[PDB]
Amino acid sequence: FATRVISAPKVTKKVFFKISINGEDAGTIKFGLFGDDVPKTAENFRALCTGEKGMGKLGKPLHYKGSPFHRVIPNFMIQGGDITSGNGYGGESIYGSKFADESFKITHDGPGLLSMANSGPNTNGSQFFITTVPCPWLNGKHVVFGKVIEGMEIVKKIESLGSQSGTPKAKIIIADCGEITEL
């Protein structure tokens, strides 16, 4: 029994980041993941929020907790998820290698979409970005797998601390993260 006539992919799992900025609590971003459409990509993100897979092959916990938003470009996107080196060059998926592009069906139609960063075809790891504008030129290059469902004002606050070069003007950390079970 449908309680909303939805114009978007179905949200099948919910996760959250708690954000600190220069060590000060900046609130919670909640995400909904499109697990019916890209289950493997959604599952990778979900597990990295809980840390449940333990230690990765690169010697760091498979866990977003403590990782920074390392590139923040106003009027474009904010990018994070380097859980191994925390500088924008690292990261690891739960699958023991970088994994293939699952689907390009969901497109970068507006702000607040979760999408995988990469370094070419089939190089998904842990790095992700959140759009703050429509980015249709990224369609077919990056796998969209979720969206912000609460705390978009925190995304905008992060975005306002960015720069044209992408170097952020404050230290923005995923202070905590996990799965929303108390649903």
**Where do the domains of the chain lie?**
1-183
Break-preceding residues in the chain (C–N over 2.5 Å): none
Dist CA 118 CA 98 (whole Å):
9
Three-state DSSP string of 59-97: CCECCCCCCEEEEEECCCEEEECCCCCCCCCCCCCCCCC
Q: How many residues does the chain have?
A: 183
What method was applied to determine this entry?
Answer: X-ray
In the numeric block, the tokens 């952020």 are attached to: 168
* Resolution of the entry in angstroms: 1.9
Q: What are the residue numbers of the active site?
A: 71, 76, 79, 118, 129, 138, 142
